Every structure is written in structure tokens, then in C-alpha cells.
Point group: D2
Chain length 396, copies 4
């Protein structure tokens, strides 16, 4: 069929208001079609496309594909975290970011490593529904807060998927609007599609108890996904994580080129007081977003979720016998992450997840790989904070 | 032989083999950090670093499918990335044409979320069938917000009053502007918190995003301030008052980088046929999702559906700092009735802090430049400095609006 | 005339005599040059009003205008209920005018709502909004949640230890132990779901419970202190850093109050016929909706507001609070409100309106509600004091009336801005 | 003796008789028989107190307990300065106990600060903070900015047009034309650089200007209306949607007040020697810094606060505001405060403290400051009325006192939380 025709002939068919056997050739024909629309048709020539595995992308990750975009990958490590060592991949185009993070890892190792805990775990979706009156929506809130009501909604939610196990609901009324925050774990997936599916069946079960309920939108911005929101900061979303380390005064002096006292002064007055004066919600850190974004791109995460995933408070205190050692912690309540699905289905992204030993599903304990990646992100963010803050204090 | 290989390094490394250099590191004849300068070519440096790293992994075959061959590392080395072990391919799709200010754009989008490019593309189609979109740049100026301390709050108050005078500001403006061609300091904004003083330097940067340039002007400006106030301590060149890569109301209210607005009217027929909904249904969902819903969630600047998706995809494709998506995604999406019988859809997005550039950083790499060239905005604009970066910002805000139209229509339609 | 300090001290020390056997001038002598500090005037002097008078005379000599206090009243006020309970170093009182806005038609009842204010037109404006609601068939409200909070911060030696305490508090058995300790301190102490947050080795714990008709801060703090003492038995290394760590959050703006609620969360609503909107409010439904979206939603958004999606709910909350003996400083969070307006009815021309106020901090027992004048304003609404057969009902009713009067005030001010002066 | 309705009305309409020649019961008989509307009472009745008296009697019959107003006082209060200026439908007045905390040692002066509250121990606590400041060598404050705002919303046909008006307002000649219009409305009107923001075809314009010693909403709104009238000449398609689009922002929480300021921006400071922290405040500098960081910075941060980085600034602000005739609803934003605490001296045992309050909304002329008891409390501080030779100094001085009393409050409460108990 299509293999017998030439390139010029197939394009003659597309323009004349009228499939291909190989994926790479389809990408080439789309480049040639697109070339005819651009003022500089030669602009595509250094946008690569050859010898990429497009089979895992089509009908899954991207449409109208004209190639790919190489992002340089560097390694910050070893990062000593919970008695293990990690070579952390970081996809960035910002010079010195990997080298800065790498120095932070070095300081943590010489202080006996970092320790981390996951505090909560559950992806969310926050639909908006409407009832005729605010009194009716008040009735639905009261019903959802009974043990009986939650149990039928939990049963509906949990019937849609293996890992769909519903946790406590959170709700808000705004007049006759009702926002309902469904939270659940999702194995090792980030869990978006899984929770929306459970939400749809849970909402249709709610509709049987309340036939006059309109489902306005499956997302009413109460999740909250990919926008800044105090609800992710206060309630969490995905993995809530804490990480810490104590850096000996010697190691702060020799590696970090500053003092424990000077680090505390900059952290308080930049990360707390400065972020406060700027009107920040959840942005009490130096540059967590650099690290999160770099790891996310390299590891097949949804990079748009750095909006909320970068939420972080970095604290720095005096520590030890002479009060000269630096205690550091980062607390990140809303790390949105996964080791299956999305961009983690592609081979290059999996290579970076394999480096960290978290690629794919953890079969013995569903969800444990994604949990480990969240811990790795929090630890690497703390390395980034340690290093950049030291540079800022030393005052270059 | 080990000491035979060291004698060849005295002449070179190019003559040796992979296993011999790795033998020289494992036995401690030579430390690993010296391999940067010794090996001549960049691609072989990446290869050795991969082999050395792989033995330390618990699964030594992890890097098999991470590509590294036949990529331009010369532009990346010493300017974009360190400890390089390869590159990460992110698929690029195209949404267009986007009909924006009498021009048509094919918008590159680096993403791995299925149906994002297709959804965005449908929004473009609805905009085009509704007579195009229009956009305006409202403000332009990258910021840096250092923190200084004085001995007392009374002294810091004195410095604030001095910076607010005509003569004080002029002396600070001259030191700032002496560092670069495009360095042109606009009115300072300051906040005191006790003996702390946070100073927000704002300025255009031509077509660069402008982080490095504003920081050079900031350091020289603070140096002149030090002569007028010797007791002043420069605590940190960034005091989170900029604010860069963290959510902050100051970016939402004062702006950062390019502030941009965009708009269009979608005819009622186009809303039914292309978007599978009505104007009345779109409006109801926008009010209660993007305003009231974001309000109930405690949002500052997150009055949109998924601006972040579009901002992030364009940013990766176009060599932007993708971490700046945090602030650059700030967006309010408004929808309302238009036309004779209130049946057409007026839509607008306003994005006050798009941080962006067409020169410097990742826009110096050729693949990223190709996507910039697709849009006709690659590199500097000699005649009108800053016009390429202003145009990309308008493209981002317009593409975001296309994305808001499409997703909001799907949410209003249900199922 | 005033005899020396020695004779003045012996007469004060004598039980048969006391401060009654001294002149004003002699008491001012023993203060000027120690022996009596100033705060001891409370317990020592014969009557409360004389103690106030003496304090005023002392104060007037320190001032640069000695006649400053001339028009600050103090005589004949009932200071018995104020000393040792509501105020110290008392030098008089401040009269705040009290107007009435009503009848407010709320839940098939009517309410004459007291409002203490000095802003001109506020009471008449709110009264106009009440009339519009009345001609629209009345307003309906519901209490959505109920629980005053307190948000202490503790510290463990490590964040891993603070993480251990968070997880233990989340087990059913762990919460049960802490709930038992909390609930034993008072008959109204009934601990609800706990919310916690970690910041490194800090752990913020939000204790929440109903509190009868009292606003309930004293009671929650006493329950909180016993709960933390018990938590220390299981975690001896835990340090209580502060009984409030600003996680409550009390008297400061905070997203947590907006999202979780504090005290009473309340929604109120009403449909105003298109006829009434024209005649009474001098505007149209179409115009009110447009002003509400673009002022109270879009405008507040551009201003970077958390919970301030309203026109002037703080005016009504503050006025009712001062009149009804509430803690007026809690206006900060109690004014949190989102006002929504949309089309309604067959024509699509009638104005639907709702106010949602997640964090009304309110009580009809304790504090300023012990004073008789502000008890009079509470009695107007039928919510004075405790409700025996149904504890908490007077405080719940007062929260409904606040949210209903706010909606009336929103109706009226929004109509005025819509019509153009 | 009570006459028929028709006879009572001929006396009412008789110009040389009126209501004076009728009894209370006759006027009430006329009201219940629908001959005089209840609102017409104000103008018909000769004496203000008698109007209040009769309004109270009417109100009482409607209440479910007729004696509920017995303890709400009304007699012998100066309603002349309240009717048609500060309050309507007036049924009396609400006395708030006034206490005094001082001396507050501020800028080498001493202040006796009046505090109207019903919360036990607030005045004593605040007074202890004053003592620590006085023995600590005093506090120093500075006014960093000054200018009340109004933030109207206007609408252009398209977003492109609103961008056109925005860029027009930013040119020096366009701004100069609007500034002459604004400044022409009052002698204090001095329009500062305009701050604007676009949301689609909306345009929020933030007019700022000093206002003498008045708080200044009447003045700023009057200047704003003439300003937008001039703007409409240049842009006739522009629609003034509301004179307030919540971009001011008045009486709602908003990041814009925190960042740009509104009213008086003020910083206050002091160094408390270790000895004084020990003997007055019963604690150490180290314990206080640890509580301050983890409560007022970190705790407020975890709660998601905008501008609420303090312990109880709102307590002090509210008490002073009620006592001094301010708009107490403006404590929502006026209470905005960040409290910082540092180690000072050779061994880190002295306590540097500062409070920064960017948006104190205050005034010594107009509003409740026209009333005489309120004026007495202003006279205590030497800030009553207008300053002749230096306009705005009295309002500025009151804002520095408010920030210093807040700092005293912060000192005391934080010491108590650092102790235990
Ligand atoms: C890339 C690393 C991560 C980096 C560093 S660094 O790695 O430590 N040091 C340098 C120094 C010079 C270069 C160069 N050749 O231009 C590169 C790296 C610094 C920095 C630190 C202390 C200094 F004295 C000077 C520079 C800065 C940096 C921070 C705030 C500035 F104002 C200005 C530069 N950044 C970027 C952080 C950036 O992406 C988020 C910040 O904007 C977040 C914030 O702190 O607000
Ligand atoms: C990818 C596009 C952009 C997309 C779409 S879409 O383009 O319109 N349609 C589809 C349908 C099916 C697939 C598939 N095969 O998985 C992919 C796209 C939808 C959507 C909308 C209405 C619907 F009835 C069904 C699906 C959703 C979507 C939104 C909220 C949900 F709860 C659940 C799915 N998303 C993701 C948006 C996501 O990245 C930000 C949102 O989380 C932001 C927000 O609205 O809060
Ligand atoms: C007191 C009432 C409550 C009041 C009113 S009112 O009830 O409608 N009428 C009058 C009539 C005459 C006087 C007088 N001075 O003699 C005072 C009020 C108005 C107002 C509003 C729109 C108009 F077209 C005309 C007047 C305003 C008011 C609002 C925004 C202004 F810019 C300017 C005046 N206010 C104050 C509201 C104030 O306490 C919170 C608002 O500032 C909150 C906000 O909307 O941002
Ligand atoms: C009124 C004063 C100002 C007051 C004080 S106080 O004046 O210093 N001490 C008092 C007060 C009263 C009595 C009494 N008779 O029972 C006894 C001692 C205290 C307090 C502090 C440390 C303590 F060990 C005991 C009490 C508290 C207080 C704060 C947070 C608590 F959790 C619990 C009590 N408050 C209330 C502050 C309140 O209006 C805003 C705070 O809630 C703001 C905040 O910190 O979040």
C-alpha cells in the first residue's frame, strides 16, 4: 500500500483532501508537511528524529510528533540516604546546577548521610458538583461525613482498579457548589488516570443518592493539580516527605566555605523572612524547583507538576555539643511522582529510574518504588539547598 | 601495563584504550577528577564516565538505553551541564496553526503526557475559526531581590528613604547600567523587615531571560550603595524577593519578566461543532472551577485549568529554564458572554510573570534553536532588542489560551 | 492637709478601717514613692469606681494635657463584672453607638440584629439589604462544621522522631489515648479528627473540638495541655515549645482556617426577585452578577487574597461582635467570606446570592458576654448564655445570624457600587 | 388621655406643636396603625434621646423577651455627633472597658496607651511588655511610607483597549493629567505613582495618596471619581464597573497591602538587655528566639499565612482602634505584622526585637474620632485632631504608637509562651 508510493506522492494526497507502515517515516512526512508552512523550512534540519523508538510514544505520550528534544543529563552523587547510596540523574540546561548539587551530596556524605521519612501518600482529584441550593449541598457534605456515606462512596471508588483504596474525603462548600477531594494511593503510578476513573464512578454513585446533583467538572481545581494552592501545602498531595542531616562544623568550613552560624542567618532571612515578604505559599526554599525539575525530566515524570512538587520549607539550626554543627531539613508535603505510566514507559527515562533502582512496579510491595523516588527527590533537594545556600552565605 | 600507560599520557590519552584508562583509575595511579582535562574529545569523556559509573550501580546495565552518541557536547560543556552521562529525548509534537496578531505559528511542545498536543491543537483550530487571537505585552523586566542588613531598623529605613530620592536612585541606576548594554534600571521596590532590607532591582535584558545580567548589575549597584552606607552587610544576592522559582504573590502583583494578556471570541457555532459544548456551559465551569475552585483551594495566581502543561512543553522544546514554570504558569483565565445574543464566547488569559528568552542558557543549543526558528524568534533581534523574547511570550500566552479553551470544553462536555 | 505616710499605712493595715479611712490625696501619696504599686488598687480600695477615679487622677498628672480624660466617661458603670475577668488598669469605658438592622428573615424566623459601629450609613445599608431579603421570601443557612482549634508546636530531637509521633497519632489506638486525655478535662471537650504537619523536627498538632456555647479557647487549651502531657508519656524526648505554634490559627490570616474551618463554618443564601432588585436595590440582576464576579472574585484574586472574596463582611462581623461581647480581634479570621451571585428562576432574571464563611469564631458564654450591656444585645437575638437542652445551639444560631447579616450587607453595598454612587 | 389617631396627626402636622405635644404612647399608637413610617421618627421627634427612647419601646414589643434592652444604656449620651454621621437606627451604646498600658518609651518620649477590650490579662500583659521596653532603653520607630488607597475596576471593550489605557496611564503626560484631576479635589491630595493590573478586559487601578490626618477613604474616593472622569474623556468606551474592585484592598486579607503597603508602613525596634529579659519577662533570649522562629515564622508558614507572622498584633491593634475612634473592621489588614527576634550582644543573651507593619490604616480626624470620649483617648497620646503646621503628623504618630504597643504585646506574650504553664 503506502510502502510502494514515494514521499512526494503521499504528501500530494494529504493536500488534496484525501496508514504508513513504519513510524519513523510518518514522522518524516509530518516534518515535510510542516516545513511547507514555516517561513524558514530549513529550521527543522537540526531538530533530530532518526532512530528513536516512536512505538511507545504514539497513542500514549505525544501527537503530531516531528522529532525529539535532547536535554543533557548529569549525575549528582553519591547521595547517602537512609544507609544507601544513589547516583541521581538530572536533566537540565542550566550550567553549574549539577556541580552545585554534587557538592551538596559530598557535604551530606561527610556528615554521615541523610535520613528521610514519607509522612503521607495519596494522589488526589477535586471535582466540583452543584446542587439547587446551598442547603442541599450542605446535606450532601453531612452525608459524606457519616461512616455509612463514606463507606458506599469508598466501595464505588475501590471497585474500579487494583490499587484504588480511598482515604478520608475532604470537602468545601461555596454556596451551592461542593468541592470533593478524593485521595488514594495508586500502586507505583503517579495515579492521575486511576483516581479520575474512581472519582467518576464514586460521583455517579453519589448521584443516585442525590439525583438533582449536577457534576459540573471532574476537576474543580480543588485537587489541586498543576496550579499553586495552599491545600496541597496543608493537606499534602502524592507523597509528603521529610529529610534531614547534620553537617559537622569542619565539613561546613572546608567543603561549603562558610560557617554554621552564617548559614542559619541566610536561611532564616532569605528562605523564611524573604519568602514571607514576597507573599509566598509553600516557597520557603532557595531552589528546590531546579532539582525537582531536573530529576523529573530525566526520570519520565510530568514536569508540569513541579508547580506543586517543588513546595518546600528548608530549615537550618545550630546543633551538636559546641552548637557549631549545622542541622538541615527539607519538608516537601506534595511530591507528585511515579515509576510506572506516562514518560516512565519510555526506555531512556527507564534508564534513569534503573540507575536509582526504582524503575517500574515493586511487585513485593506495591507503591514502594514511587515512595523511594520521592525520598530521593527530597534528599537531592536538600543537597541542592545545602550547596546553593552555602554559596550565597560565602557571598560571591 | 600500568606505568607504560602513564608515559603515553605525558606526550597522549587519545592513544590509550578504554580499559587501560579505567585500569588506571581503579588501581589508584590517577584520580578520577583529572580525567576531565586529560581525555581530548568530549564524547569519549562521556563514555568513560558512564563505564566508571556503571560498575558502581546495583544493576550495571542501567544506562544501556540512555543515549549519548552523536550529540553536540561542546555547547553543553562548561555552560549548561556537568558530570554528563548522555541526554534525555523528550518527544516534540506540534499544535497549530495558532492565529495570533495576524501571524500564524506552529508551536513546538516537548511533552510525554498523551493527548496534550492534540487537545491544544483543537483549541488552536477553534481560535482560527473564530477570527484569531490578539495579545499585548503589558510589562517587561526581569528581577533580582537581594537582602541586605543594617545594624538597626532605623538605619535600614534611612537606606529605603535614600533609594526613594531622585538623587539616590540616580547614583544606583548609573552603577547598575554600567555593567551591560541592555541594563536599564527601572523604579526600585523595597520592603523592610526589621533591620533587613529587601531591594527588588528590575530591568529589561534585550532578548535574554536575564538572570546573569541583572545579578551583575545588582552586585555593582550594591557596591555603590556600600560606599554611601559602609555598615550595610550584603546577606545574600538573592533574598527570595525576586522571586525566582518559588510561588510568590510579588510576581503575581508586580510582574516578573514579561506580563502578557491574550484574547479571542469564539462564535457559538464553533463552540458546538469544534468544542462539543455551549458558551453558557463553558462560562459556568470557568467561574466555578478557575475562580471559585482555585479560591477554595487557597490559590495565589493559579486561576486557570492547566497553563503549566503548555508553558512546560514549550519551555523544554525552546531551551527555556523549565524550573521557571513555577512562576511562569501564573495565569487567570476569564470567560464571558459576547455578541448580539450573548451566545459567543469571549476568552482571555492574563499571565503577569512569563520568564523567558531567545538567547543564553539552553537556547544556545542547536536542537532547541530549531524550535525557536520554527516560531521565527531564535536569537537576538538586532533592529529591536527584546522583540524576539516578547514574541515568544505572546506565543506562550496564546498557546496557553488555546489549551484553556480545549480542556475547559472537554470538562464542560463531561464523560 | 495630708498626714504623713506612716499614719496612712497603719490605717490601711487595720481591718476595721481600711482604705475607706484615707483621702484621695493620701492614696496618691502612697503610690508616688512606693508601698503601693498601682495594680494593688484593685483589691485594696473600698469600691471599684473609686479605684478607677484614683487611677485617672494619677494618669492625668503624667499627661501633657491634664484635661485629656474630661470626656472619657467612668461613673456609674458596673465594674464588678470587669475587674479580674475582662480588663486591667481600668480608667473608664468607650461608648460605641448601637444601631439595629432588621427584621432579618432567616430560617423562617426574624431577627433584630444589633450593630456597634461609628461608620456612617453602615447600619442603614445593612438594613436595606435585610428588606430586600425579606421581600424575597427569606434567607436559609446551615452550620457545616463546628469546632474551635488550638495549634501547639512540639519538637522531637530529629525529624524522624517527629515523623514517628505523627504516625502514632494517626493510629486508632494512639488517637484514642490522646482523645481520652483531652476529653477528661471538661464535659464539652470532645476531640475530633487530628490534623498534623511536620516542619523538620517541629510537629504542629491541630486539636479541634466543640465547646458548648463558649467560643472555647480556654477549654481547648486546657484539653490540649493534658493531651500533650499524655503524649509525652509515650514520647519522653518531646519538648512542648509553645501551646500555640500559630497552627490554630488565632487572630492572624491563615489558609488553614479557610480550608479546614475554625469555630463555625456557615453557608447562607437567598433568591431576590428581579422586581425587588430594581425597586429596593436600584440595580439589576445582570449588573450585580457582573460586579460580583469582577470585584469579589477576579479583583480579590488580582489582589492576592486568601479568603477575602467578599465586599465588606468585616464591617458586619466587627459591628455585631462589639455589640454582642465577642472578641473583636477575631474579626481577622471570622470575616473570611466568599460571596457568590448568579442568575435564578424561570426568566433567569432573579438574583441568587450566597455567603460562605468557614471560620466564624463566636460564643454566647464567657469573655465580654458576661457583661450585662452586651448580654442585652445577645438577648435581642435569643442567644444569650448557654442552651441547656441543646448545648452549643445559641452559639450556632449566632453564627447563622452573623452570616445572614453579612449576606444582607453584601447585597446592599454591592448594589450601590453597581449603580454608580 | 391618649387621643384618637386623627387628632394626634393634626398636632403632628401643626408646625408650632409637633411630636413634642404628643406622648410616647400616642406616637407609638400612630406607628402601629401605619400613619408614620418607623424611619420618619428621626426627623419628626425633636430630641435625639427621645427618638432613641421610642425606637427602643417599639423594638421591645417585637422581641421574644420584652425586657432584653433593660441593661443596654442610652441616656445622657451625645447623639448630636452620632446621628447623620456615625450610626443609624440607634437604640443606645455599648460600653467597652478602657485600660491603660504604659509608659511606652518610644522615640525618646513616653506614651500612656488606651486599650478598649474585654479579654482578661491583655492590658496587664501589654503593660508588662512596656516595662521591658522602658527598662531596656526604649524603642525606636520609623514611618517608611504613607498613603491610603482605592482600587476601582473599569472595563474596556477588549483586553487590547485595557492594555492601551494601562500604557497611557504609565506615560508621564497621561499620568500628569490624571494627577491634576485627583489633586484638585482636596488640599491633601497628592497622587503617587499609579499601580495597575489587567485581567482580560478588566483594569484595576490603585490610586494612592496622603490624606492629612484623616484615614482618608472619603477623600481618596472623591479624588478617584474625578480622576476616572478625566480618564473617560480620553477613553469614552471605558465603563466604571465599581469605585472599589477589591484592589485597594479595604477590609479583606490581600497580599497587595502586605507588599505595596496601605496607609502607614511602620517599623519598630528595641534591644532588651539580658537582665531585663530575666527579671521582667521571666525567661532567656534563647528561649524567646526559638519560640519566635518556630511559631511566628515557621508556624505561620505551615498554616499558609499572608502577613500573619506575629503572635497577637490584632489584639493590640483592635484595643487601640476601638478606644481611639478608628474603624475597627480595618484591623483585618492593619494587624498585618512580622515579628522578628534576634540574639544581640557578646554572648547572644540580649534580645533584638522588631515588628514591621506595612499597612496600618489609621487617622485622627473624621469618623469615630469626631466623638468626644474617643477624642479623650486621642488626647492622652497628644494626637487628637489635625496638626496645623505639619499635616499628617498626628496620624503618623498614632501609627508609630500602634506598632510600638504591638511590639510590647509581642514581647510579653512570647515570653509567657516560652515559660510553660
Ligand atoms: C547554578 C547554581 C545553582 C547557582 C549558583 S552556584 O552554583 O552556587 N555558583 C555559581 C556562580 C556563578 C556561576 C556563573 N558561571 O554564572 C554559576 C554558579 C549561584 C550563585 C551562588 C552564590 C553566588 F555568590 C553567586 C552565584 C546561583 C545564583 C543564585 C542567586 C543569584 F542571585 C545569582 C546566582 N545559581 C543559580 C541558582 C538559580 O537558578 C536559583 C536562584 O535564583 C534561586 C534564588 O536563590 O533566589
Ligand atoms: C491530556 C489532556 C489535557 C486532558 C484531557 S482531554 O484532552 O480533554 N481529553 C482526554 C481524554 C482522555 C485521555 C486519555 N487517553 O487518558 C486524554 C485526554 C482531559 C479530559 C477532560 C474531560 C474529560 F471528560 C476527560 C478527559 C484531562 C483530564 C482533566 C481532569 C481530569 F480529572 C481527568 C482528565 N486531561 C489532562 C489534564 C491534566 O494534565 C491537567 C488537569 O489535572 C488540570 C485540572 O483540570 O485540574
Ligand atoms: C458605609 C457604607 C457601607 C458604604 C456605602 S453605601 O452604603 O452604599 N452608601 C453610603 C452613602 C454615603 C456615605 C457618606 N460618606 O456619607 C457613605 C456610604 C458605600 C457606597 C458604595 C457605592 C456607592 F456608589 C456609594 C456609596 C461605601 C463605599 C464603598 C466603596 C467606596 F470606594 C466608597 C464608599 N460604604 C463604605 C464601605 C466600606 O466600609 C467598605 C468598602 O471600602 C469595601 C470595598 O468595597 O472595597
Ligand atoms: C490574653 C493574654 C495576652 C494571653 C496570655 S497571658 O496574658 O500572657 N497569660 C495569661 C492569660 C490569661 C490567664 C487566665 N486568667 O486564665 C492567665 C495567664 C496567654 C498565655 C500565655 C502563656 C501561658 F502559659 C498562659 C497564657 C494567652 C494564651 C495564648 C495562647 C494560648 F494557646 C493560650 C493562652 N493569652 C491570649 C492571647 C490570645 O488572645 C491570642 C493567641 O491565641 C494568639 C496565638 O498565640 O496564637
Amino acid at each position: 500500500g503506502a510502502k510502494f508510493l514515494s514521499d512526494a506522492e503521499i504528501i500530494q494526497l494529504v493536500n488534496a483532501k484525501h496508514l504508513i507502515e513504519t513510524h519513523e517515516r510518518g514522522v518524516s512526512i509530518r516534518r515535510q508537511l510542516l516545513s511547507k508552512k514555516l517561513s524558514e523550512p530549513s529550521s527543522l534540519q537540526y531538530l533530530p528524529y532518526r532512530d528513536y523508538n516512536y512505538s511507545l510514544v504514539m497513542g500514549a505520550c505525544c501527537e503530531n510528533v516531528i522529532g525529539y528534544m535532547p536535554i543533557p543529563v548529569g549525575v549528582a552523587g553519591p547521595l547517602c540516604l537512609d544507609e544507601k547510596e544513589f547516583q541521581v540523574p538530572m536533566a537540565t540546561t542550566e550550567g553549574c546546577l549539577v556541580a552545585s548539587t554534587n557538592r551538596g551530596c559530598r557535604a551530606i556524605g561527610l556528615g554521615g548521610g541523610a535520613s528521610s521519612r514519607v509522612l503521607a501518600d495519596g494522589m488526589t482529584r477535586g471535582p466540583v458538583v452543584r446542587l439547587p441550593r446551598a442547603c442541599d449541598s450542605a446535606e450532601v457534605k453531612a452525608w459524606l461525613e457519616t461512616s455509612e456515606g463514606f463507606a458506599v462512596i469508598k466501595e464505588a471508588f475501590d471497585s474500579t482498579s487494583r490499587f484504588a483504596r480511598l482515604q478520608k474525603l475532604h470537602t468545601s462548600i461555596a454556596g451551592r457548589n461542593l468541592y470533593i477531594r478524593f485521595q488514594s494511593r495508586s500502586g507505583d503510578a503517579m495515579g492521575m488516570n486511576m483516581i479520575s476513573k474512581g472519582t467518576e464512578k464514586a460521583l455517579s454513585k453519589l448521584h443516585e443518592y442525590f439525583p438533582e446533583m449536577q457534576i459540573l467538572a471532574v476537576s474543580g481545581n480543588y485537587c489541586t493539580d498543576k496550579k499553586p494552592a495552599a491545600i496541597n501545602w496543608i493537606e499534602g498531595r502524592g507523597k509528603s516527605v521529610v529529610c534531614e542531616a547534620v553537617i559537622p562544623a569542619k565539613v561546613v568550613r572546608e567543603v561549603l566555605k562558610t560557617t554554621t552560624e552564617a548559614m542559619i542567618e541566610v536561611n532564616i532571612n532569605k528562605n523564611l523572612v524573604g519568602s514571607a515578604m514576597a507573599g509566598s505559599i509553600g516557597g520557603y526554599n532557595a531552589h528546590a524547583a531546579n532539582i525537582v525539575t531536573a530529576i523529573y525530566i530525566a526520570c519520565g515524570q510530568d514536569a508540569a507538576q513541579n508547580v506543586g512538587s517543588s513546595n518546600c520549607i528548608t530549615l537550618m539550626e545550630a546543633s551538636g555539643p559546641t552548637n557549631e554543627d549545622l542541622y538541615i531539613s527539607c519538608t516537601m508535603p506534595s511530591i507528585e511522582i511515579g515509576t510506572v505510566g506516562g514518560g516512565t514507559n519510555l526506555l531512556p527515562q527507564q534508564a534513569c529510574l534503573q540507575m536509582l533502582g526504582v524503575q517500574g512496579a515493586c511487585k513485593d510491595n506495591p507503591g514502594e518504588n514511587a515512595r523511594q523516588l520521592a525520598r530521593i527527590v527530597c534528599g537531592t533537594v536538600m543537597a541542592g539547598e545545602l550547596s546553593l545556600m552555602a554559596a550565597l552565605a560565602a557571598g560571591h
